Structure formats: structure tokens, C-alpha cells
Amino acid sequence: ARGPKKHLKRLAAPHHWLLDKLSGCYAPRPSAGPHKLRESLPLIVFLRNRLKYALNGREVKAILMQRHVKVDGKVRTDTTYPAGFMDVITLDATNENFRLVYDVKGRFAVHRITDEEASYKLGKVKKVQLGKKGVPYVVTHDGRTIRYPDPNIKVNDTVKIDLASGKITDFIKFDAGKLVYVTGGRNLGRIGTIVHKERHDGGFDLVHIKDSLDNTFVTRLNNVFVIGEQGKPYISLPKGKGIKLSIAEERDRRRAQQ
Amino acid sequence: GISRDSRHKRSATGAKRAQFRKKRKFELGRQPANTKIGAKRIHSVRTRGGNKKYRALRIETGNFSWASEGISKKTRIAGVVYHPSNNELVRTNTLTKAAIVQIDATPFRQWFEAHYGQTLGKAERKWAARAASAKIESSVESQFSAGRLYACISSRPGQSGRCDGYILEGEELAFYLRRLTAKK
Amino acid sequence: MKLNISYPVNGSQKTFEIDDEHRIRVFFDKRIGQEVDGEAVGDEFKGYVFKISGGNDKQGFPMKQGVLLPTRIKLLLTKNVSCYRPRRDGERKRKSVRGAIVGPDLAVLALVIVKKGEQELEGLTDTTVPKRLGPKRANNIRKFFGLSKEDDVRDFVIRREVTKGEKTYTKAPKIQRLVTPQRLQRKRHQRALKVRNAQAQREAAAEYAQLLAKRLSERKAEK
Amino acid sequence: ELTVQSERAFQKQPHIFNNPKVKTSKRTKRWYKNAGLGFKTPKTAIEGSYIDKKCPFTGLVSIRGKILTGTVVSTKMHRTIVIRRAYLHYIPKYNRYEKRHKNVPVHVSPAFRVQVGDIVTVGQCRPISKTVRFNVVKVSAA
RNA sequence: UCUAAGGGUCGACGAUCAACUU
RNA sequence: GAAACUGCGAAUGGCUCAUUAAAUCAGUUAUCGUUUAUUUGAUAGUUCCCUACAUGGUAUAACUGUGGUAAUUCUAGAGCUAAUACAUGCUUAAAAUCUCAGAUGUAUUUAUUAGAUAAUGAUGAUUCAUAAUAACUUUUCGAAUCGCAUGGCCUUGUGCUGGCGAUGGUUCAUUCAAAUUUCUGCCCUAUCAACUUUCGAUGGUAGGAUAGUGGCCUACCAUGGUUUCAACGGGUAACGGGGAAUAAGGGUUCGAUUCCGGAGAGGGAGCCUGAGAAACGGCUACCA
Ligand SMILES: [Mg+2]
Ligand SMILES: [Mg+2]
Ligand SMILES: [Mg+2]
Ligand SMILES: [Mg+2]
Ligand SMILES: [Mg+2]
Ligand SMILES: [Mg+2]
Ligand SMILES: [Mg+2]
Ligand SMILES: [Mg+2]
Ligand SMILES: [Mg+2]
Ligand SMILES: [Mg+2]
Ligand SMILES: [Mg+2]
Ligand SMILES: [Mg+2]
Ligand SMILES: [Mg+2]
């Protein structure tokens, strides 16, 4: 339609932002950036709707323009910067670090982490390719390219990114028995261990995940994120650890506070 | 202007498609370069994405590869002797991909004499190292007597501004010689 | 008919009212830059050679440099031409401009005095206007004031005293392309950045080559 | 293929150079590929003399989309066939189906021999003509 | 000023010969 | 801090539903068929046949001054002056390998080579990534840019170094996109049964053109392609869908209209700028 759009109408925004229906006609359209549009979380949404630190976009911009907020070690004074999965949002004033992880409901949960863990981040290897001059590189889920990766690092692996030098300290390989985060689809936000991987050459790789409750669910390879080994995640999991309780037991737990 | 859309160009059932969507810029075509020979004239075309194409009009010289020894000398194009798509391109000497042209062959002769020292067209032991595997072909070597080598244009002059190509050899040269002595 | 006559040397311009056809026929049939003589046009001018450069006709349409017509025509005008200012990037407009050939249509001609023949005009040499602004670029000031390259032009830039509240503070231009320690520091920083990046890439490549050799040797030792 | 060099232009695989200086063995160096998805490269494609830049094994096309099956109903075009794809369309109101068909023009390589009938498997390729978007990959001549 | 198609004879090709119509 | 030059934006938004019936659209595919400003990440020691302690006006706007026309966001002549505008042009290693001292960065174009493997990366798959060889180029890039802090060494000099940034920039990747695209699915009508094909209709070869695939166009060639499983034609007071009303169940009717997709800016056509428009609060022409 003659060019790229710049507005995001309300009721067209991603549902996991949990934006009010009647606050306005428009939602914050995420700027171009690391992760995505629908799979992202703008800094304005994170600061005004999740933390309630700001009351409107004007206060969000006032907070940003004094270099307080910081995404993956960089200031990111952009109001609609597309913060996404595994991104570390550190506030130096009121020093606290958040890791953008999905709760089991598929929303970006408010997840406090320590400084020693905000030092790094995890990135799913989107591709492995030889660059110019024959220099191999890996492309991660958040748009990072890291030169000279370990030759055993393949697609669907996970790499730990130093986030200060932007280098790979360690890497987890995709195979059965590894802890995985689900980053899309129906099972978004669930955590389990890889059981099996169906190939379907030419189609879409499928992977079966078994959570701690022995519940098994299938999902595409595009939305599984290796986050460590069974019972030992490389990142701190959110409050619920992605267990996917049914509505009945959720109501039981809610009523368990009498 | 020229349009590459399929909204015209009636469907496979033969039905005439009703018109919507007045011509779009992202489906435009442009005029052929119709490259000629001599007095190099390259016009830049601003293409989609801010990129640049080069309409070569009146090309004089091109880079032609022997491809049997890997030489790729720059040489003058004499004229067009054959074109598989249109005899009018041969008649008008239109430079175009896959056109069979004649090239000066002087740079290739000079390289051959400086490489093998083997009287092609009529520090020391490099020529001796270049052993009895120095005969090229009885049909390529005979063209050096007239000083004109048959070559095929491999670049697209209207797209890239260059008239590069390769010297015909083997079965390709035999095929094009058959066509040339049949139609001439 | 009016004559917008200008003397570029030291600056001057004034408008004459030449209402006599007998004394104005000399400008006819001459397009641009011809040897129209002051003694040929009027008695006030003696020995003046006019550079006949432009004009406006009745209805105010300007003359275009190379139309070569006695009348006015509509031209599709572009960015870098006369008689049109594009209000938008890439905009072109079809505007009616008048030809270059001078004729009875013109309401005002514009003349440039290129040669001085006889007694001065009352708006030619007695009145002169100074150059409003001095040079800004450092080498431009050096060329204007005639000094050499290594002469440290930082002091005698043309200044101006503004007397508004009896403070009379000088106003000198910020001169550009100055050789400054800040600029030298920027250049040094750029060279250092390039060399540091090259060294970092070289050592990363060396470490990766070491890694590859280690893995290959391990594989061949594992058979 | 019956004087393969039957066009005005010399027919050859691009960038597959038969060096006349070397006295090689086969003397007709031929490029072929495994099309993928378990489709076997036919021996005709392996050892033939046709060029067919649109062949899924010896040409410049790739099979990357939908894999369809059809019944050949026309072999009257040059290196192109029409396959009839019969299917049942569900009409919910009557809880029943109706027979429907769609004709798909498919490019057929000289590696395959195809006649009317001859249920074939076709794979999606890039547009290679106005109407053709599929290439025969398995002949299954029955 | 050209281009293309349409033949005879003789030994999937070669040699030779030939007239017009598009 | 006016004005103006420069940069970016003005291609978003908003409006409307006229066209449009395999078209749009919906779900589902593909790009191993392409372009992509911007964002984010990475990325550039190679530039020469007497400036770099930094080049030019080949430049001018704003401004000064003189005007024309009744009238326009019309502008003319003359006199100045800047750049992250325009046009130029150096400094930054060592080593190795080829050629017979020169060359080897990157971008472009061509050709050739490697890209392996049951007993030297990736993909289901490639002529992929990438590298190499020989050349090629109306030379692409390889900062002559800006702010703030001022530091270390020291021959104490216009000394040599040096921080945090901003902007600009080649390529790759990413993101926002775009363009095509697979499969299936549209209401009534036979008082529409044949339709398309000279003037492209279906396919092949080659070329041109495109950002790229493709009869998209051209040349030559073949005679194909759709259809009673409704083609083609005609009608729509038809933009499609999410949905709305009514609804035991099944259905029937509606959906211009708060979201998504498309299309258009009186009707047409053409085009400049730009990453992106066949733009209309942009231009050009014709019609009214
Ligand atoms: Mg809009
Ligand atoms: Mg390649
Ligand atoms: Mg083609
Ligand atoms: Mg409707
Ligand atoms: Mg309507
Ligand atoms: Mg509607
Ligand atoms: Mg209506
Ligand atoms: Mg709408
Ligand atoms: Mg429009
Ligand atoms: Mg109206
Ligand atoms: Mg328009
Ligand atoms: Mg309006
Ligand atoms: Mg508008």
C-alpha cells in the first residue's frame, strides 16, 4: 500500500501486551529492531503497563531520555524499541534487572533477576553461515551475528551471550532430554524437556516436549528455545516454571488462599 | 509505461480479465538498449531500491575469456555474425547476450606467443615447461590467420553495460560454424 | 520601457526610463550578450557597452536564456533552471516564459555594464555598495587577503560592530575547514580505531585457526 | 534426444565446461542433481543428452513447495503436460460431497516418458511459464 | 537492400541443378 | 534564535466503496524467484603515476540592492557568503602467494576452479554460503563531518598519544516491509455451449525488460489451453473477510460502515523525486 505502515491500531496489537480496549485508537507500533513486531514488547508497554512506573507515553519518554532504561547493556531511549524474549532490561536508578520471559499464559512476565545473571543472556541460533572472507558466523533469535563461533554450534542450538563484549561463553546443543522454552504457538510459555524430533523433510520440524508433570505436547521447531538441561536452566525461570495448570487446578490454587 | 503485470494477458481459460489497479510502478518495463558497436556510450538507469543499471549503447570493447587456458583478455568486437533469436540483430549489428560476434584476437595471439612461443597466428624454460599440451584446436587456431575469433556474448549489455563473452570452442564452435556456413 | 542597469564592479544598480522608440530600437533583435552601445541607445551614455542580460515583458514574464524567440512560450521547467523554483523535491511545472530575443514586448530590460567609455553615470561609480559578507572558509580568507598557507588566519577575519545598546560587540564569522587540534584528534581517533579493529580481527582469526587445528588433530587422533 | 541440438542456439548446461584441451573420459561432462524429498534421479537424467534448463534434475529449477499427485490428461505440448486432479468438495448444508477437478499444467523432463493416464507426482517450482508452476518428479506409469 | 518458406536429379547426410509464388 | 541551504518526513494517517466474480479476499504455502529507507548486530591497515597541521568554486541559497506583471507559495538582473550540499583528493603494519619489479581490499561483469567422502560448512534439494584463477568497469565504497570531556607520556612543542558520544558509510545478517506465489473455497443466470488463438491464446528455444520469476515483451517454432465437475458470456441496487440479525437441530438473510486485506482520490493515461507512489492536500497532458 505505497509503503510501510507506521500506525498500529488497537485491537490489531499483539494480545499478550494486555492493552486496554478503550484507552485510544492506537497501540505502540514496535519500531524495527532485534526480535519482531508481534513477538516483541515495546519499552513503553513494559514501563507503563507492566511496571506502572510511568502513567503515560509522556512519562515513558521522560524516563527514557534521562538514560535510565537499558536493554542488553545499551541505553535504548526509543519509546517503542522492540524488546523481546531473553532481553535484559536493567534500571540503574532503582537498580533492578528484568529478563523478558514468557509466563505460562503466554504474556511477557515481570521477572526480576540478579546482576550476576543480567550480565549475560541466551540466544537461539537462527542460522550458521560463512560470511565474507570465509569467516563463519551465527545469527541468533534477537538479530545478533557472532563471528568465529564454535564449529559444533548448529542451527536450533542455544548460545550464552556475554552481553558486555557480545561473545559466546557456552552453547547448549539441541537434542532429546534438554530443557526448552516454548516461544510461540498454543503452548507459548511452557517449559519442558525434548522427547523426540520429527523431521518432515521439506515441511516443518516437529518436537515433542514433556513437562515436569509428565504432560506431553507437540510444537514446531520454530518456537522451541533450548534453555539448558533437565532441571538446570541456564536462566532463572519465572514464578510458575511453565507448568500449564488446567483451569480447574488454577481455580483450586486461587481459592487455596482463604 | 511498459507493464509486466498479468492482469492483462488474458487467463489460461481464455477469459478477458476486467481491469482494476491502474498500472503499478513495481511492475514497469523499459525500452531495450539495442546496443550497437563503437564509440562507447553508457547511460545509467535508476532502478528499484535506488540501484543502478547500465544501458550500454554503442559498445566498443569487451572482456572475452578463452576459457581453455583462463586468459580473459580485453578485445575489440568487430561485428555480429549470428544471433539465435533474431536475424535482425545480426543485420543491425546489435550487441546482446548469446549473440555470436567476432573479436580482434590480437590480445589472445599476443598472450599465446608470450605464453608458449608457438607461432599461433604468424625465465627461458617456462615455454619448455608449457609442454606439448599447447595445441589449442584446428578450428580455433585457423581463425588467427584472419585475426578474428568467434565468440559468444555472455553478459547482458542492456543490463550491466558490459559486452563480455567467451571464445567459441569444441562442439559449440562446431555448431555455430555449421549454422554460419549454412546461412552464409 | 525601463532599463535595470547594473555595474558589477564595486556594486551599483539603477533603473532608467527610456520612452523613445527612436533611441530604443538598438536593443531589438539582440538576444543575450551583444555589443549594444550606450552612445547607440541614449545621449546620457557615451562609450558604454551593455551586456544585455534578461528582462521582463508586459504581464511580468521573465526572459529565458536560450528560447531564441521574440514571443513567450510554456516550458516544462525543472530544478536547476531559471524562472522556476521547485516547491517539492522532483517537482516540475509548465510555466510560460518569454524568449531571449528582445523586442517591443519587453516592459523592462536588464543590462550589465561591461566597459566604461566616458563620464560616469549617477548610479555607476559615485554610489558603490560594499560586499555584505567577508569570506568564511579559512582558505577562502587566505586567498582573499593574499597571505600564504602557513600564516595562521584566525585574527583578521572581517568583523562588524553592532551598536544597539552602546556595547558595540564585534561579530566575526565561525570560519570553516580550520586546522584545529579537535579535528586532528578526530583523525587520530579514526586511524587508531581502524588499526585496533584490524588487529582484533587478526587475533580472532588466529584464535579460530588454532581452534580448528586442535579439533582437526583431535579427529585424526580419534580415527 | 533425436538430434538434441535442434534449436537456433547451442543447447548446453550453463557453466558446465567440457575442456577440449584435456582428453577426458566421458567427453560429454553432464551436470545432474538429487532433487530431494526422496525423489530418485532417473537414469535417463543421469546419462541423457537433453539440456532442459527447466528439468528438476539437470536444469536450474528446484522443488520446494507443494507435492501433488495427478492423472495425465494431455501430452500435446512440448515438455509440458496437463494433469487432472480429482477431489471431493464438501457441501455442509447437505452433509455430502461433490466431484471436482482442477487442471494443472506441469513441465515434464525428457528424463520421464509420459502418456495419457500415467499417474504422476509433481513438485512445486518457480514459475517457468505463464501457467506452469510444477515439475514432474516421479512418473509411476500405471 | 535484404530475410524466410515452398523443389528436381544423383550418390538421416552430401553433391549438383533450377523456376516462380508467398 | 527568524530566514534560508542541508537531512528526514510528506508513500503513515484519515476518507470512501466506484470498479472488481478465480479478480479481491480467507485460511495455507513459496522465494533454491526478488527489492527492502529505517532499526538492531556484525563488518572496511590494501586508495599513489609534490595539500593532508585538511582541496576547490567549477556556487549558491538565505541576505543587500534594482525591478516586471491586475493577479499565483510567479519570479528576473546584479553584489556576497557556509556545508554531513556539490565536486575532488593523501596519510594507517608486517608477512605470504603468484607473474615477469609489479599485483593481490571492496564493489561491478564475464569465464574457469574448489566447494569432497559407504569400507573441506549448510540444505530434503542447488551452479548455495564462501573461497580461488584471469581479466573487466561513462569507477562503487573504503569519513577532508559534528558535540562534550579533557587526559597520559614527554625531546616542554603547531610535540606524540588518548576517552565518551553524534552523524555518515561498503557488505552480510536482522527488523519494518514489499512484489510475486502453492492449494482449496465466491451470489444469480443456458432466452450464455462452446470459448481463447492474425492483434499472445497454450507451450519450447533464445533474447530483451524487470528488483527478480513468468508470453511480461520480441524473434523463430509447435498447435496448443478452458469447458455440462458449467468454461466463455451476461447480471449484481457485489469491495472480500473477521462478523450481524434470526435462530430446537439444520439453516435463511445481511455484512457501504470501529479490525485485517484490496482499490480510488471527477474520468483516463503518463511521469519526477524517492527505499518505498504510477502519489493526486505531487507534477504533465487530454476530457468534463
Ligand atoms: Mg493509508
Ligand atoms: Mg555463487
Ligand atoms: Mg527467458
Ligand atoms: Mg457481500
Ligand atoms: Mg459497487
Ligand atoms: Mg464490509
Ligand atoms: Mg454502494
Ligand atoms: Mg479499511
Ligand atoms: Mg493510490
Ligand atoms: Mg467528488
Ligand atoms: Mg494519480
Ligand atoms: Mg483533498
Ligand atoms: Mg493523500
Neighbours of chain D (3+ CB pairs under 8 A): A, B
In a domain, A254, yes or no: no
Q: Are A225 and A180 in contact (CB under 8 A)?
A: yes
Residue D9, chain B, CB below 8 Å: the answer is yes
Q: Which three cell numbers stand for residue B85?
A: 533469436
B85 CB and strand E closer than 7 A: no
Closest CA in chain A for residue D64: A202
Distance from CA of A158 to the nearest CA of D (A): 28
- Residue of A234, A85, A96, A239 lying closest to A172 (CA atoms): A234
The domain spans of chain C are 1-130, 131-223
Number of H helices, E strands in chain A: 4, 21
Give the CA C158 to C1' F18 distance in Å.
67
Q: Which residues contact C134 (CB under 8 A, 6 or more apart)?
A: C141, C144, C157, C158, C173
Phi, psi of B144, deg, nearest 5: -65, -25
CB neighbours of residue A5 within 10 Å: 9
Which among A135, A147, A151 is the nearest to C212, CB-wise? A151
Q: Which three cell numbers stand for residue A203?
A: 515441511
Burial degree of C123 (CB within 10 A; 0-12, 13-18, 19+): middle
Side-chain-side CA neighbours of C147 within 13 Å: the count stands at 15
Q: Which three cell numbers stand for residue A102?
A: 514468557
Q: Are D28 and D12 in contact (CB under 8 A)?
A: no
Side-chain-side CA neighbours of C95 within 13 Å: the count stands at 19
In whole angstroms, what is the distance from residue A118 CA to residue B55 CA? 56
Q: Which residue has the cell 528439468?
A: D55
Q: Are A125 and A153 in contact (CB under 8 A)?
A: yes
D6 CB and strand E closer than 7 A: no
Neighbours of chain A (3+ CB pairs under 8 A): C, D
Q: For C9-13, which contacts have Cβ atoms below 8 Å and span 24 or more sequence positions? A: C9/C113, C10/C125, C10/C128, C10/C129, C11/C128, C11/C129, C11/C130, C11/C131, C12/C123, C12/C124, C12/C125, C12/C127, C12/C128, C12/C129, C13/C123
D3 CB and strand E closer than 7 A: yes
Q: For C128-133, which contacts have Cβ atoms below 8 Å and span 24 or more sequence positions? A: C128/C10, C128/C11, C128/C12, C129/C10, C129/C11, C129/C12, C130/C11, C131/C11, C133/C158, C133/C173
Instruction: Say whether both A81 and A129 belong to one domain.
Output: no
Q: Which three cell numbers stand for residue B43?
A: 547511460
Q: Which CATH class is domain C131-223?
A: mainly alpha
Does 3.90.440.10 match the CATH number of domain D3-142? no
Tally of residues, chain C? 223
Q: How far is CA C27 from CA B173, C18, C24, C107, D79, in A?
A: 72, 11, 6, 12, 78
Q: Are B165 and B64 in contact (CB under 8 A)?
A: yes
List the domain range (segments joined by +) for residue A204. Answer: 174-244
Q: Map residue A7 onto helix, strand or coil.
A: coil
Question: What is the torsion angle, in degrees rounded to the nearest 10, for the CA atoms of residue C170, residue C173, residue C178 and residue C183?
Answer: 90
Residues of D in contact with B72 (CB under 8 A): none
Report how many domains make up chain A: 3
- Residue of B80, B71, B69, B91 lying closest to B148 (CA atoms): B80
Q: Are D124 and D134 in contact (CB under 8 A)?
A: yes
CB neighbours of residue B112 within 10 Å: 22
Q: Map residue C202 onto helix, strand or coil.
A: helix
Our CA angle for D115, D121, D122, nearest 5°, is 100
CATH code where residue A212 lies? 2.30.30.30
Instruction: Say whether both A38 and A111 belong to one domain.
Output: yes
CB neighbours of residue C213 within 10 Å: 10
- Residue of D69, D47, D64, D45 lying closest to D55 (CA atoms): D45
Torsion sign, CA atoms B148, B150, B153, B154: negative
The type of residue at C215 is R
Q: Are A97 and A236 in contact (CB under 8 A)?
A: no
In whole angstroms, what is the distance from residue A131 CA to residue A186 CA? 36
Q: Are A142 and A178 in contact (CB under 8 A)?
A: no
Instruction: Say whether both A141 and A38 belong to one domain.
Output: no
Distance in Å, CA A15 to ligand 8 centroid:
21
Strand order in the sheet with A96-99: A69-71, A88-91, A96-99, A112-113
Tally of residues, chain A? 258
Our CA angle for A66, A71, A75, nearest 5°, is 30
In whole angstroms, what is the distance from residue C4 CA to residue C54 CA? 10
Our CA angle for C38, C42, C47, nearest 5°, is 25
Q: Are A150 and A172 in contact (CB under 8 A)?
A: no
Q: Which residues contact B24 (CB under 8 A, 6 or more apart)?
A: B3, B5
Q: Which residues contact B108 (CB under 8 A, 6 or more apart)?
A: B64, B66, B71, B73, B75, B144, B149, B167
End-to-end Cα separation, chain B, in angstroms: 39
Distance in Å, CA B24 to ligand 11 centroid:
11
Closest CA in chain D for residue B173: D10
End-to-end Cα separation, chain C, in angstroms: 104
Q: Are B176 and B168 in contact (CB under 8 A)?
A: yes
- Residue of B63, B47, B64 lying closest to B55 (CA atoms): B47
In whole angstroms, what is the distance from residue B172 CA to residue D94 CA? 65
DSSP letters of chain B?
--B--SSSS--TT-PPPPP-S---GGGB------B-BSS-EEEEEE-GGG-EEEEEESB-EEEEE--SS---EEEEEEEEEE-SS-HHHHHTT-B-TT-EEEE--HHHHHHHHHHT---S----THHHHS-STT---TTTTTHHHHT-EEEEE-S-HHHHS---EEE--HHHHHHHHHHHHHH-
Strands C2-7 and C106-115: parallel
The domain spans of chain B are 1-30, 31-105+148-184, 106-147
Deposited experimental method: cryo-EM
Q: Are C67 and C102 in contact (CB under 8 A)?
A: no
Phi, psi of B15, deg, nearest 5: -70, 145
Please list the residues that pair with A121 across neighbouring strands.
A161
Q: Map residue D68 onto helix, strand or coil.
A: strand
Q: Are C3 and C9 in contact (CB under 8 A)?
A: no
Measured in whole angstroms, how far is the alpha carbon of residue D2 from the centre of its chain? Answer: 19
Instruction: Say whether both A3 and A88 belong to one domain.
Output: yes
In whole angstroms, what is the distance from residue C175 CA to residue C140 CA? 10
Q: Map residue A135 onto helix, strand or coil.
A: coil
- Residue of A130, A244, A236, A135 lying closest to A191 (CA atoms): A244
In a domain, A106, yes or no: yes
Give the burial string for A143-177 (b: 16+ CB within 10 Å, else e): ebebebbbeebeebbbbbbebeeeebeebbebeee
Q: How far is CA C222 from CA C20, C217, C218, in A?
A: 111, 8, 6
Measured in whole angstroms, how far is the alpha carbon of residue A107 from the centre of its chain? Answer: 10
Q: Are A69 and A39 in contact (CB under 8 A)?
A: no
Q: Are B66 and B115 in contact (CB under 8 A)?
A: no
Q: Which three cell numbers stand for residue D20?
A: 577440449
Q: Which CATH class is domain B106-147?
A: mainly alpha
In whole angstroms, what is the distance from residue C207 CA to residue C215 CA? 12
Element (H, E) at C186: helix C181-222
Residues of D in contact with B68 (CB under 8 A): 19-21
Residues of D in contact with A202 (CB under 8 A): 36-37, 64, 67
The answer to whether the CB atoms of D130 and B85 lie below 8 A apart is: no
Q: Are A42 and A83 in contact (CB under 8 A)?
A: yes
Q: Map residue D102 onto helix, strand or coil.
A: strand
The type of residue at B72 is S
Chain F: bases < 7 Å from a protein Cβ: 9-14, 19-23, 29-33, 35-45, 53-57, 62-71, 73-84, 91-93, 100, 106-113, 120-127, 129-131, 133-138, 143-150, 158-159, 161-165, 171-186, 195-197, 200-220, 222-233, 250-252, 258-265, 268-280, 282-285
In whole angstroms, what is the distance from residue A163 CA to residue A145 CA? 13
Q: Are B84 and D8 in contact (CB under 8 A)?
A: yes
Q: How far is CA D87 from CA A45, D70, D84, in A?
A: 49, 10, 10
The answer to whether the CB atoms of B172 and D12 lie below 8 A apart is: yes
Measured in whole angstroms, how far is the alpha carbon of residue B145 from the centre of its chain? Answer: 22
